[PDB]
Ligand binder design. Structure first.
Ligand SMILES: [Mg+2]
Lengths: 365, 270
């Protein structure tokens, strides 16, 4: 560390070097902080967490009890110990409270004033943060497994929604248009994720073992269908070209958006080239997931090496994205881990679980 | 539209008059005896298909070719009010030295109008679905090029729909269609890029007959269309309830989450 400080101060190394190497050191030293706590407000398991992209101060949380909690992650107290207090909550007495499990919650990118949340009550509700009243509701004929707003779209404000239906619903928040559908899957879409690089590229993963990349502008179907083998087992595409040997219940683009991470119920995670959907053949070992719903996992950002934090049963397994080497397994939960979300400013991780807890993992020292 | 472009296109003026013709006494008698006929009663009871009666009434307003009544041959112009109007209009327009575009939904009615025009000394030209396709564009070219030809007899289905007939100057839609756009395109066959003379469109409806009801249906359809092509603030069609009493003869005499939220509150408050 002193070598790094001397190299920064004297100009030998670009300051980016110290930032990234130190962020990596902080990620490797990630450990259950009993020096930070998150206030318990969910009566049920936390399915989803979303730290706001701008300022990374506030966190959303969606529980299996249908409540939504809005936490403050800043240590406003002068103590070195603090509990991330719950600023707001869409509770059991809120007239717009979700009637069943909240399966996803997402901040509106580009601004903290609005956030969206989808539930098994077959609704995607748009919320105004400040008044904490619904601004819009998109009713679906089938329960929602996962929604996603493009983190990048300065132009369009589409929400890609995956339900048990075989079609992907695109809901335009600008004048409310929930008619657009991307058809081509055959079973429940368990995960949807817009590309962080391309405004109109959407990756959708379904229980039929297939992951498709779409260009929602295009009028001619999915761009790419991910194939495990890349052509070794090639068939006229009616049932082949599966990303996994089970359900694909998790999607995550790497930070730069040039690669796609899929996790499926074959107990595998794969890394794909997001441009041509070619498997990179990164091993990653065995990733125990048997989740019957969407599995939310995140990547690191701004480190010397990129990481992926995947829920591994009751632990959070940390892997290097581009080598497969499992960094470690963070074990502090008591039941299966449903979701983890990465605070990119301080290399902090928050993970929710079915045990009605949200655990902060902070670097040691 | 030809209102956001027309000033930038140097098109001549346009009229869209709708004439309410009157049934003649014999045409009225046939229509009255058909609405009073038992077949209409079977239609109104759901026993028989509405299409038969609708077609019969449309034929009656076109011309009583149901019962074919010298100078009493088939399709004599004086037996139909719309043909009386057409004869007067053709007389005036011929003396005004003008070229007319005479449309009809029906091939049979087009044949009647052809026999009528040849009863006059008018020189005409006819293009329905039977005229061989290979001759249709020559026909159009002929009509557009030499002005000795006075009227152009057209079915709205072949004579509408993309053909350029700017050599025509007057256009009369002899008979309405259930579909509004058939007649919209038929009337727009004249007032196009290339029309150097003022155009007026005449739509002939028999007053108080099925034709006025078809006109009401297509006004309603046009309003439903304008609600979603030109503006969503359309005036409700109130002229009628558009029901199954059209078998009655009634001869007259990045967004920053606040524009977005504001739009949401707007949409939902409605
Ligand atoms: Mg054309």
């Amino acid at each position: 560390m002193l070598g790094f400080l001397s190299a920064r101060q004297t100009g030998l190394e670009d300051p980016l070097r110290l930032r990234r190497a130190e962020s990596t050191r902080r990620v490797l030293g990630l450990e259950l902080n009993k020096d930070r706590d998150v206030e318990r407000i969910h009566g049920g398991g936390i399915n989803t967490l979303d730290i706001e992209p701008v300022e990374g101060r506030y966190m959303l949380s969606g529980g299996s009890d249908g409540v939504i909690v809005l936490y403050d992650l800043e240590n406003s107290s002068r103590q070195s110990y603090y509990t991330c207090k719950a600023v707001c909550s869409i509770g059991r007495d809120h007239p717009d409270v979700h009637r069943y499990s909240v399966e996803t919650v997402q901040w509106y990118p580009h601004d903290t004033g609005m956030f969206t949340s989808s539930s098994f009550d077959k609704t995607l509700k748009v919320w105004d943060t400040n008044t904490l009243q619904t601004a819009d509701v998109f009713n679906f004929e089938e329960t929602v497994y996962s929604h996603h707003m493009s983190p990048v779209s300065t132009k369009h404000c589409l929400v890609a929604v995956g339900t048990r239906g075989p079609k992907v619903q695109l809901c335009d928040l600008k004048s409310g248009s929930c008619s657009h559908i991307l058809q081509g899957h055959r079973q429940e879409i368990l995960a949807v994720s817009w590309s962080p690089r391309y405004d109109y590229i959407l990756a959708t993963a379904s229980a039929d073992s297939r992951v498709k990349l779409w260009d929602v502008r295009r009028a001619s179907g999915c761009l790419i269908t991910l194939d495990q083998h890349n052509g070794k087992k090639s068939q006229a595409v009616e049932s082949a070209n599966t990303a996994h040997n089970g359900k694909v219940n998790g999607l995550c683009f790497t930070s730069d958006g040039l690669h796609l991470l899929t996790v499926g119920t074959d107990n595998r995670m794969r890394l794909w080239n997001s441009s041509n959907g070619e498997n990179t053949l990164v091993n990653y070992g065995k990733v125990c997931n048997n989740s019957k719903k969407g599995l939310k996992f995140t990547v690191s950002c701004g480190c010397s090496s990129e990481f992926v934090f995947v829920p591994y049963g009751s632990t959070i397994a940390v892997y290097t994205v581009y080598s497969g080497e499992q960094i470690t397994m963070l074990k502090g939960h008591y039941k299966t881990v449903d979701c983890c979300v990465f605070q990119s400013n301080f290399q902090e991780l928050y993970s929710g679980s079915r045990d009605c807890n949200i655990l902060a993992w902070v670097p040691s020292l | 539209m030809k209102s956001d472009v027309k000033m930038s296109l140097s098109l001549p003026d346009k009229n869209e008059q709708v004439l309410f013709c009157r049934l003649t006494d014999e045409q009225h008698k046939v229509y009255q005896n058909f609405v009073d006929s038992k077949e209409v009663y079977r239609i109104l009871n759901g026993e028989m298909q509405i299409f038969s009666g609708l077609i019969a009434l449309r034929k009656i307003c076109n011309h009583p070719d149901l019962f074919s009544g010298e100078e009493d041959q088939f399709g004599y112009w004086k037996r139909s009010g719309k043909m009386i109007v057409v004869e007067s209009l053709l007389k005036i327009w011929h003396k005004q030295g003008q070229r007319v575009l005479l449309f009809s939904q029906s091939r049979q009615m087009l044949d009647i109008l052809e026999v009528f025009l040849r009863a006059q000394k008018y020189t005409y030209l006819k293009m329905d679905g039977t005229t061989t396709i290979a001759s249709r564009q020559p026909l159009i070219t002929r009509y557009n090029e030499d002005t000795s030809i006075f009227v152009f007899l057209l079915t709205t289905r072949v004579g509408g729909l993309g053909v350029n007939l700017t050599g025509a100057n007057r256009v009369v839609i002899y008979d309405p269609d259930w579909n509004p756009s058939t007649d919209t395109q038929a009337r727009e066959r004249a007032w196009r890029i290339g029309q150097k003379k003022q155009v007026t469109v005449y739509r002939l409806l028999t007053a108080g007959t099925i034709e006025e009801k078809i006109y009401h249906r297509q006004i309603f359809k046009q309003f439903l269309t304008n609600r979603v092509l030109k503006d969503p603030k359309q005036r409700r069609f109130f002229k009628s309830n558009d029901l199954y009493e059209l078998f009655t003869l009634t001869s007259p005499d990045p967004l920053a989450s606040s524009s977005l939220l504001a739009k949401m509150r707007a949409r939902n408050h409605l």
